[PDB]
Symmetry: C3
Subunit: 260 residues, 3 copies
């Protein structure tokens, strides 16, 4: 029975963990201010939709990272027989506790933020509703199944079956980004900025399942602290700079996206 307080103190006293988390909370807040200021000029409703959708990314990120830092969305789980992190221990409170400190809260960051990124990119590319619906539903399925994998402690094999379903959903999102929206952006007159954001999104997103497989959730070659910093670095690019690049464009081309 680990308390939220003990997990909160655990993040603290842990150099890599505390920094990877609190640094994103600060970068998330600064992004919001920068983005709100960068977009005060917008007037086109559609251009503003792309703007707000994008601003929600760091908004979800600051709130979600606070969920982790606070200890609210953190748990200690025991990995099943065969798992490379099975048998691990953690010092919480005044005793050694079996298990791994699991930052499941990240999956909430992803479930709520990724759809916004997709909504922004889809609108930017001039996507019809079918593709937006397809990309977003499967993106959500990808995040939720990823969370289920991280939460499964009954069977090592089951954790990886979850991982495989999540990857299949990932592929659907990738196909829309790489093939469908790439084409739609041409008709939208945003093919250039879309290619840039598209490349950045694909490379960064491909990084998450890699970190998962290598971190404590996977084969654990990366300690709980390094797994967290890997994710945090990826978020900075996939979220904060991605958002800046998109907004930097929008604010100079409000006329191009001003449609229906």
């Amino acid at each position: 029975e680990v308390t939220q307080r003990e997990l909160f103190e655990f993040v603290l006293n842990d150099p890599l963990l505390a920094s990877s988390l609190y640094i994103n909370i600060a970068l998330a807040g600064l992004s919001i201010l920068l983005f709100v200021f960068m977009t005060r000029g917008l007037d086109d409703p559609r251009a503003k939709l792309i703007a707000v959708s994008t601003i929600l990314v760091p908004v979800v990120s600051i709130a979600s990272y606070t969920g982790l830092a606070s200890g609210l969305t953190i748990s200690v789980l025991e990995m099943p027989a065969g798992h490379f992190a099975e048998g691990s221990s953690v010092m919480l409170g005044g005793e050694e506790v079996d298990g791994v400190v699991t930052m499941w809260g990240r999956y909430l960051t992803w479930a709520l933020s990724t759809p916004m990124i997709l909504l922004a990119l889809g609108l930017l590319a001039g996507s019809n509703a079918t593709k937006l619906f397809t990309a977003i539903t499967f993106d959500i399925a990808m995040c939720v199944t990823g969370l289920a994998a991280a939460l499964t402690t009954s069977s090592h094999l089951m954790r990886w079956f979850w991982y495989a379903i999540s990857c299949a959903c990932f592929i659907v999102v990738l196909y829309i980004l790489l093939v469908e929206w790439a084409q739609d952006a041409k008709a939208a007159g945003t093919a250039d900025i879309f290619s840039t954001l598209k490349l950045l999104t694909v490379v960064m997103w491909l990084g998450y399942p890699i970190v998962w497989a290598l971190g404590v959730e996977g084969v654990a070659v990366l300690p709980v602290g390094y797994t967290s910093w890997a994710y945090s670095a990826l978020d900075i690019v996939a979220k904060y700079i991605f958002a800046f690049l998109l907004l930097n464009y929008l604010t100079s081309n409000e006329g191009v996206v001003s449609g229906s």
Copy 2:
């Protein structure tokens, strides 16, 4: 350790607490039967959409209040060091239990009912998709971060940080109600009814973050039973009477709200 039945019994056997819960269950139930009856004559689809979104308010309310009354959405939390309610006891059942009875279920009632209130009001004001999206998203963020605040026990200051984040989201919603949709109602031809509903909402909505701060979750000047009734009083106005007013107007201005 505390069972659901023990919380269910705690609510009963306590006139204040129970009355603030079972009364809203009955009032909600009656409001549904009344709202459905009231709108049975509607024929326009857009008008019908506003009525259903409004009818969902008391639907979500009766379900959520049942969640609280049954003990399903209630928990016992120990406040952090420095919290005005630290070191409290409850006596769940017949044993003295440390902590405070936390009715976190109210937040779900809010995260699900407020978007419906906003959707109805936005449509009534002739709002475009951009503003509805902005209003609803930040509103949900408001409710979720508010829930996170109540559920945080690791730090006293963390709770207020959540509270601060939620207030920021609250201001975004308020701005759209007061400034944005105020102008939209004009062109939509519902400027006069929106005024009454706008005021009512902004005044009633301001009561929640105030009650929070004064109740057990906040500085704790109001006992658990008084906070409950404070919220229930607010729910009765911001939901039932507010919904009756909106519906009464809608049924009288179906033609106007339909557009063409």
Copy 3:
């Protein structure tokens, strides 16, 4: 003190229970491959929306059934006084545990998939946004209040009160399916197929609250393993075959539903 592993193992070792779960994981997966293959030639965006909504049904189902088989969305609950399943035991890990193995994960399978079934049927019927919004919101309310009913252990009466609220939400869905969309399909040119799929849906959907009342969650004439197969059988028809029938039509009549999103 019941762990996810103990529940995972309880399912395994229980022939009825393991089969009701793993068979659907397999049929859901085969359904997805079959459905993606069937709809490969679609081009119209409205036709494709109907296809994706339908395909999402077995996608949700495979994930959620894995949730159940893994033990992630299963818990042990003790029924309230007067409940026909009160005082039951389950034997987990090694000792006897009071309560009933509660597969609440099924409600998540429902709350996420039923909306897709409705979206697909609504579009097939040429429904306007109002009825679609009304059908989907009350359907979700139906699934959520149902989950609350199963999760309620404090009062036997409260359990059935949640059940009644859920039924009322169900009546809204049924009304839209039987009265509203039945007429819209005529104007959409999809009466024949819609009426068929609507009827198949209504009959199967009616099966769920009946199983709930007869199963371990209700009067318990059906033990845990049997209530599970009752639900798994309903799912096979209401999801996999229903979706297969709907896609069979879609892929031979793209032009009829082509219209515009």
